[PDB]
Amino acid sequence: TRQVSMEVISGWPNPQNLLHIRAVGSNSTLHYVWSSLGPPAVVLVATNTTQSVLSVNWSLLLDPAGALMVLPKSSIQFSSALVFTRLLEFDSTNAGKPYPPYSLAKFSWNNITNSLDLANLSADFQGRPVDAFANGSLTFKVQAFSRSGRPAQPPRLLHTADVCQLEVALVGASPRGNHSLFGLEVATLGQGPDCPSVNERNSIDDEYAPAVFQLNQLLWGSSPSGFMQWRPVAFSEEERARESALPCQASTLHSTLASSLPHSPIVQAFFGSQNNFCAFNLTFGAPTGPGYWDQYYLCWSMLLGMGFPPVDIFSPLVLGIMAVALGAPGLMFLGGGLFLL
Amino acid sequence: SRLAHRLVVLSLMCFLGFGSYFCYDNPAALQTQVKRDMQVNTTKFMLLYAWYSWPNVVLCFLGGFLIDRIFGIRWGTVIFSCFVCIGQVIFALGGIFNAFWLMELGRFVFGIGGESLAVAQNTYAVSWFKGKELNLVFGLQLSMARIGSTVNMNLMGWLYGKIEALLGSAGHMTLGVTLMIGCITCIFSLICALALAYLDRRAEKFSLPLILVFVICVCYYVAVFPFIGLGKVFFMEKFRFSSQSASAINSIVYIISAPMSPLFGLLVDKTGKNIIWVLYAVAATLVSHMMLAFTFWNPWIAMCLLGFSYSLLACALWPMVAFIVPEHQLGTAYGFMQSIQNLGLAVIAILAGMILDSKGYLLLEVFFIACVSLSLLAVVCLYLVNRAQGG
Ligand SMILES: *[C@@H]1O[C@H](CO)[C@@H](O)[C@H](O)[C@H]1NC(C)=O
Ligand SMILES: *[C@@H]1O[C@H](CO)[C@@H](O)[C@H](O)[C@H]1NC(C)=O
Ligand SMILES: *[C@@H]1O[C@H](CO)[C@@H](O)[C@H](O)[C@H]1NC(C)=O
Ligand SMILES: *[C@@H]1O[C@H](CO)[C@@H](O)[C@H](O)[C@H]1NC(C)=O
Ligand SMILES: *[C@@H]1O[C@H](CO)[C@@H](O)[C@H](O)[C@H]1NC(C)=O
């Protein structure tokens, strides 16, 4: 149980979008920052103190290397970041002729305050190109949370009132071929010099989002810290039914050098490493079955935030049916004694 | 001796049922292929099996009633195999005249023929082979269908190509004669039926626990088969199996049944209390479903026990109605069991298909385990009831 609060900043020399999310509880605070200057980006800040604020300076951000920090420097711990640096056009017309990627740096993202509404705790990012995405573009859907619960959307996750949601989609696209395969290039940034470890977990319960039993994870440290999580599925149409599975695939983490991906100014402001970038491609779908040809839009869901990653909990229904199933052998032992008398 | 120690009748009995268990899988063996003949979509092609399952319960009940009342045990087989051959030849005629409702009408006869022949075979084997070596004839009856179905599936496909290469390339109407060359199996059933009738002519010179046994049969045979019918999709998601090697798991509860059931049939009658065997088989089935559903252990182990617990429940449960209801009434009880089992399977296939996408996969296993638990409860209740009277 923690509070929520949104806030936006604009600069007179050059207005741009900036959404800052603050969650405060008893003795812990979170400092999600969502910037879309050139690329979309996320930076996490954890403070053991219950009071902490930001210090913005648009003058430095106007080769910027300014400081965007918090006053309690001693409370700084586990600062991490993600950068959705590129969108990859994967073709593989036979089973794959890598059409040149679209750079997520020349998009004129719309005003946040137009779509922001604290009642539902959501915001929209939509950039469009300057030269594809003629009608509509990527639509990022950031969302905070207040209490533990389960969303009603067809991709059902388990938020712990301490994480965020990043339903990402793009509406309206003209493919460069008669095939559907899209990809994103997630580039993490570990606080310490190491390689983040990605694993794969197995779950018994399948009441939620049927036909999948795997719950991916990505931990920046073997300790209480931040974590990624997403069910390996992707939906293409609003009535997200079991038909449109469209499986997604991960990759292996590399250690790429600088200048291989565009640099987000927000990350350079929060950090000073800019050399330990680790990126992995993230494809959607396969030519095996249903793809992205009938519709014009692809949706994905994932979490982000610090805390203990939820696993699953069995629902009362299956537990009760198991209980009544176990009643059958026990019932006769009562009945057997009845005939015994 | 009486009839050469039952050897010739045992040999003839197993070969009687090629009329129904051979030509049943023609559309399954001819999946697609005939789709491009004139025009066929997937939805329509399932009507070739709906007529074999839905208009069956009342018709098989009527057939059993006729066997009990009018026809008698002797002439039941000869007329029902005649219905089988009539259905097969009219199916061939519908193939040769290119009409589809002629094709569809064949199933309206072949279904009654097959089910009535099965019930007549069961009651006849019970009537004659009683006393010694009783559970074994059910073993061969079960094994024959599995040893014939795959052979037909391969042989019809091979003969299609053989006839296409030899006779020539007609206007793709050769499937009619292809069915006709497959129709030759049904005549053998007629010959066996007349031979059996001749031998029988020369040879001459309800209650409470029955309902419980019906419940056992319905519960087990409705909680086992649709799980296998589901098959492919579940094992491609719960476990990581290749698209090709996954067919070994789904199709091993059948291929291990026929080479094993005669052994259990031979073993059970020799010093065997049937109730104990049935209880052990049902407990094994429950353990197998629990292991498969609630743990990630190797599916080979969990699916191996199902083969034994399905090959042992057969040829060890049906003979129960041989002792409970006396003679002069088997032809109705067996038909009632067949009707209720067929209706249960037909009504639960749709329910499972409807619940699969609506709730997932864990709930399906939960429901199956509940059904098998009810089966075990009724089994042990039958054990409790038999304690008082006995015999
Ligand atoms: C968003 O709207 C506010 C309304 O006053 C304006 O001040 C700001 O410059 C706008 N920013 C963008 C990027 O449109
Ligand atoms: C913030 O910007 C102002 C204006 O350029 C500058 O004078 C000040 O030093 C900056 N604060 C820093 C760099 O901490
Ligand atoms: C928060 O963590 C910093 C780490 O350097 C420590 O110095 C400080 O005492 C901590 N404060 C509380 C209230 O735990
Ligand atoms: C395949 O793509 C070409 C253009 O690249 C297009 O003209 C054609 O209609 C496409 N084929 C189909 C079946 O859509
Ligand atoms: C992703 O795919 C692109 C395709 O051009 C390739 O160059 C790159 O090495 C792949 N991996 C990463 C981490 O970007």
Author numbering:
A (entry chain B): 38 to 99, 102 to 134, 142 to 177, 182 to 391
B (entry chain A): 36 to 240, 261 to 446
Paper excerpt:
Here we deorphanized the major facilitator superfamily domain containing 1 (MFSD1) protein, which forms a tight complex with the glycosylated lysosomal membrane protein (GLMP) in the lysosomal membrane. Purified MFSD1 selectively bound diverse dipeptides, while electrophysiological, isotope tracer and fluorescence-based studies in Xenopus oocytes and proteoliposomes showed that MFSD1–GLMP acts as a uniporter for cationic, neutral and anionic dipeptides. Cryoelectron microscopy structure of the dipeptide-bound MFSD1–GLMP complex in outward-open conformation characterized the heterodimer interface and, in combination with molecular dynamics simulations, provided a structural basis for its selectivity towards diverse dipeptides. Together, our data identify MFSD1 as a general lysosomal dipeptide uniporter, providing an alternative route to recycle lysosomal proteolysis products when lysosomal amino acid exporters are overloaded.
We obtained three-dimensional reconstructions for the apo- and substrate (His–Ala)-bound structures (GLMP–MFSD1apo and GLMP–MFSD1His–Ala) at nominal resolutions of 4.2 Å and 4.1 Å, though the luminal domain of GLMP and core parts of MFSD1 reach a local resolution up to 3.43 Å. Given the slightly higher resolution of the GLMP–MFSD1His–Ala dataset, we used this reconstruction for model building. The EM map resolved most of both proteins, including N-glycans (Asn85, Asn94, Asn157, Asn228 and Asn331) of GLMP. The TM helix of GLMP is located directly adjacent to the C-domain of MFSD1. Arg292(GLMP) is in hydrogen bonding distance with Tyr416(MFSD1), and the loop is further stabilized by an intra-loop interaction of Asp256(GLMP) with the backbone amide of Ala261(GLMP). A comparison of the three-dimensional reconstructions of both datasets revealed an additional density for GLMP–MFSD1His–Ala in the cavity between the two helical bundles. This potential binding site is located approximately halfway into the membrane-spanning region and is formed by TM1 (Tyr56 and Tyr59), TM4 (Glu150) and TM5 (Gln176 and Arg181) of the N-domain and TM7 (Tyr276 and Phe280), TM10 (Tyr365 and Trp373) and TM11 (Gln393, Gln396, Asn397 and Leu400) of the C-domain. Our combined cryo-EM and MD simulation data provided a structural basis for this substrate selectivity since a highly conserved glutamate (Glu150) and arginine (Arg181) residue clamps the N- and C-termini, respectively, of the dipeptide in an extended conformation.
